[PDB]
């Protein structure tokens, strides 16, 4: 029943005022960051021709314990400022600036939400952060900058106490998510609109958050395809804007009448 224009009018008329957002790697491929579960001829093609058996192994603990070097090549590549946010991030920034953003839940570890100017208090980086690290042998914690010099020098960082490999607090497969993830217990019942951008919804427990909003809440998917619970268990007020994520965001921006703000924001930032 609901269209993208309907959602735009709900926002314009302040009928939807507390927006929660879920994003994955699909919002950052337009910035040049390949999706580790849908890679191309760039970073992951080169590592797979050196010592990476498959891309998901970068985030698997058994492989890391065997050869941590592929992961740290990726860590070096994701140093903030190596990539710039694209229109998708700055749209989320605009949501925040206009007082509509309750929380932005991201599966990405590229830090582009923060680079776009969204405050940390609005963010839940559900798949971890490079801001801290943990020795894989003795479990001592370390500030993330204590290993940066090593990573940028193509050195595997090691613990000063036991010499084990120190791993950034990125959430690997088989690991729990940060406790800040549990903000969803209150954030999602309180949302009156859910936006889902650029994700496959194939990674749990993050994906199941799409079911945590109330049945009254529209769920707007801006993605190349209809995916996850949105595809198998649709709700009456779901909306799918399918295609290039940038074109879908730009279409919503135009329907919101935010084109001029977006242009102002981008030039002031870029």
């Amino acid at each position: 029943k609901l269209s993208l224009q309907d959602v735009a009018e709900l926002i314009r008329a302040r009928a939807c005022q507390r927006v929660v957002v879920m994003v994955g790697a699909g919002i950052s491929t337009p910035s040049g960051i390949p999706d580790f579960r849908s890679p191309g001829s760039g970073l992951y093609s080169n590592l797979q021709q050196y010592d990476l058996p498959y891309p998901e192994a970068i985030f698997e603990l058994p492989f890391f314990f065997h050869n941590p070097k592929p992961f740290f090549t990726l860590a070096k590549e994701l140093y903030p400022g190596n990539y710039k946010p694209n229109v998708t991030h700055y749209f989320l920034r605009l949501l925040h600036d206009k007082g509509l953003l309750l929380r932005l839940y991201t599966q990405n570890i590229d830090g582009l939400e923060r680079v776009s100017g969204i405050p940390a208090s609005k963010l839940v980086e559900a798949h971890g952060t490079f801001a801290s690290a943990t020795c894989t042998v003795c479990q001592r914690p370390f500030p993330g900058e204590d290993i940066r010099a090593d990573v940028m020098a193509d050195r595997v960082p090691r613990c000063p106490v036991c010499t084990g490999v120190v791993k950034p607090d990125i959430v690997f497969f088989g690991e729990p998510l940060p406790q800040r993830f549990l903000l969803h217990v209150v954030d999602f019942p309180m949302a009156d609109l859910l936006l889902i951008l650029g994700t496959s919804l194939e990674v749990e427990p993050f994906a199941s958050l799409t079911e945590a909003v109330r049945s009254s809440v529209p769920r707007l998917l801006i993605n190349r395809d209809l995916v996850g619970p949105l595809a198998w268990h649709p709700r009456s007020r779901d909306v799918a804007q399918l295609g290039d994520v940038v074109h879908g965001v730009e279409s919503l921006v135009e329907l919101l009448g935010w084109t001029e703000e977006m242009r102002d924001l981008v030039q002031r930032e870029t």
Binding site: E56, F172, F173, G174, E175, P176, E202, E204, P205, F206
Partner: peptide, 6 residues
Amino acid sequence: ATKAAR
């Protein structure tokens, strides 16, 4: 509770 792919 832990990160997994379907």
